[PDB]
């Protein structure tokens, strides 16, 4: 159960990505794409949950990975 909290932008956009590439989710309609590990989204707290070093990044639908979260080990 790995969490990633995004703050500083509207959470509804910017598909959230996980890299050790593992998977991605969209905070709208909850579309998922996997490469054993599931992902969920929380609207109120704007947090991405990773069920099981892991990095958390956000990007547009076809754009580059802009900001990378810290690892958890």
């Amino acid at each position: 159960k790995l969490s990633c909290k995004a703050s500083g932008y509207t959470f509804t956009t910017h598909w959230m990505h996980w890299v050790q590439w593992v998977g991605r989710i969209d905070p709208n309609s909850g579309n998922t794409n996997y490469n054993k590990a599931t992902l969920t989204v929380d609207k109120s707290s704007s947090t991405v949950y990773m069920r099981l070093v892991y990095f958390c990044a956000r990007a547009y639908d076809y754009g580059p990975f802009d900001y990378w979260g810290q690892g958890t080990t």
Binding site: H17, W21, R24, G63, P64, F65, G71
Partner: protein, 88 residues
């Protein structure tokens, strides 16, 4: 597809399997990354030429489809498979 690049041994070079021009414009879908061994990766260049703001001007990237390079480090596509490339 698979992405390969030069060994750990300036001008690096990353090469993909098939073409990377996916847009109707002449825009590639490659990104360059770097990381201090104790920090998260940092985006250096996107669209293979744009040189994102916040980076020194010494990092100049160029290249057409399947043939990319970086002058004075991961190469990553961000369109379909989001796979990286092992290298120094």
């Amino acid at each position: 597809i698979v992405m390969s690049q030069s060994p750990s041994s300036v001008s690096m070079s990353c090469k993909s399997s098939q073409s990377l021009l996916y847009s109707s414009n002449q825009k590639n879908y490659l990104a360059w990354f770097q990381q201090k061994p104790g920090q998260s990766p940092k985006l250096l260049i996107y669209w293979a030429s744009t040189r994102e703001s916040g980076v020194p001007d010494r990092f100049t990237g160029s290249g057409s489809g399947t043939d990319f390079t970086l002058t004075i480090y991961y190469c990553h596509q961000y369109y379909s498979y989001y796979t990286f490339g092992g290298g120094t």
